[PDB]
């Protein structure tokens, strides 16, 4: 099935989605881009984009806040599509199997961050002399060691999924458990929401929660329309509210 010119592409896409795990700027540390990018290289694209869409809804509220490392949606979204796109499985099985991988997750990315200290104990020895090139190639060199620990476990998998030992041990789930995880896949997502609302919770703005709640039950807006009505409401509230008018 998987050919040698797909292993390299999966490896490079995992490396890209391993740079983003700490870098947190272009957001390949997201189960959306890291999933479409794997779906394109491995095979069919729609069945990877659907995994991507489903996996973010959990991975809202999976941020890093001050040495509180997130559950690493960057490794849980590359192993969890090779086990669907490549080996013959269903969406809800991969979504359920992502959680232990996300637990692997921050355990790995905490050891990497801890062992990164040798890149600063070798940085002061450079600042004491210069030049800055000794720093511009030490800051990047600590990035080629985290991308090689989200992209190696994505080649151990994509070379062992292609055997009967795993492809037959993944069918004794059984089918009763599988349909019991496609049901938790509509419930676990709620946790991802509660972590978000806990950040942006003000007692006087909770009326905007239950307002965006009811208008979802009985109306057929998109999320683009609900994201535009939200900003219009926010701008008009800031325009009113004489807290910003006077003393």
């Amino acid at each position: 099935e998987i050919t040698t010119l797909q292993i390299v592409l999966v490896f490079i896409v995992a490396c890209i989605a391993g740079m983003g795990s700490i870098l947190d700027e272009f957001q390949f540390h997201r189960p959306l881009i890291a999933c479409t990018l794997v779906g394109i290289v491995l095979g069919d694209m729609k069945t990877g984009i659907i995994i991507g869409g489903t996996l973010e809804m959990i991975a809202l509220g999976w941020m890093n806040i001050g040495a509180a490392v997130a559950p690493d949606a960057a490794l849980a979204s590359i192993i969890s599509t090779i086990l669907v796109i490549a080996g013959h499985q269903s969406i809800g099985a991969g979504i359920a199997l992502a959680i232990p991988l996300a637990a692997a997750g921050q355990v790995l990315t905490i050891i990497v961050r801890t062992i990164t200290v040798a890149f600063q104990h070798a940085a002061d020895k450079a600042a004491d002399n210069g030049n800055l090139t000794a720093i511009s190639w030490i800051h990047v060199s600590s990035l080629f060691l985290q991308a090689m620990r989200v992209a190696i476990p994505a080649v151990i998998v994509a070379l062992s999924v292609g055997t009967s030992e795993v492809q037959n041990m993944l069918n004794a789930i059984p089918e009763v458990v599988t349909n019991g995880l496609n049901i938790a896949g509509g419930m676990i997502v709620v946790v991802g929401y509660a972590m978000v609302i806990n950040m942006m919770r003000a007692g006087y703005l909770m009326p905007f929660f239950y307002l965006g709640f009811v208008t979802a039950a009985f109306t057929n807006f998109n999320l683009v329309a609900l994201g535009v009505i939200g900003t219009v409401m926010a701008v008009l509230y800031i325009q009113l509210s004489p807290k910003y008018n006077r003393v």
Binding site: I22, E25, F26, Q27, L32, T36, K46, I49, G52, G53, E56, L60, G61, M63, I65, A67, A102, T116, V117, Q120, A123, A127, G130, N131, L132, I135, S136, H139, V177, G180, I183, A184, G186, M187, I188, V190, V191, Y193, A194, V196, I197, N198, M199, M200, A202, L205, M206, F208, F209, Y210, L211, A216, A217, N222, L223, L226, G230, M233, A234, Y237
Partner: protein, 273 residues
Amino acid sequence: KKLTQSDIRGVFLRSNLFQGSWNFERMQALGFCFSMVPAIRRLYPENNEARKQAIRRHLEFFNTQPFVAAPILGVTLALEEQRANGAEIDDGAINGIKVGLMGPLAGVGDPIFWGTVRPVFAALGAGIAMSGSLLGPLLFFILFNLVRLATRYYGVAYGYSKGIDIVKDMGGGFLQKLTEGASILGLFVMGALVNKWTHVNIPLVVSRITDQTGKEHVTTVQTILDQLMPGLVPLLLTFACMWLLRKKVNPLWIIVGFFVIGIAGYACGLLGL
């Protein structure tokens, strides 16, 4: 020595990969030296005292958000001329400003970009990634990698031309507007996501006949709750989980609870798609 305009263009491009080497001893510390390398390139020649500034850029934490770090970069760039060209003596206060802008900007930036920006674009581009193909994972990558760039280029440029004097100025009033408008959008969207974009179903039948020539007129418990509000059960589950999270329970220890419930509830008819 008159930091060239293109040098700011350089600091912008070199600040994109800000987060390190995100250590635990000195978080983002090396990333700050790396972002200020281009300034120290033409600001100094090779010298004992001229090249001890890289020591002070490591001297302590710099632990803020990657996106609200452009104002700090622009302010600390401006502080260098007053120490290099103007030679106005300042050693401790360069780190003083870093530490002073660490605090508020770490708490005003996290509840915006990880607040009402990342999971709002991640929700707009994930209600489409289910059905659609490339308007979900592309309305995210375009609309979020612009808001982070307008926060960095317009951060560095506009925080460089304005020194300390308008740190205490825009540090009062504007950010209250920006985080009271953020947590209105992000609450309006999260109220909708909890309602529609969650699935909970209860197939417990509670009523028989079944008139009208074999229609069975089945009315499970989900119809009773959908008679009040079509998203009630996920709403209550959200307040339960929203209460658990203040007690600092691991979210990976609440997800497993739901995985247990989805198996023990479908095997008794309580939950079911």
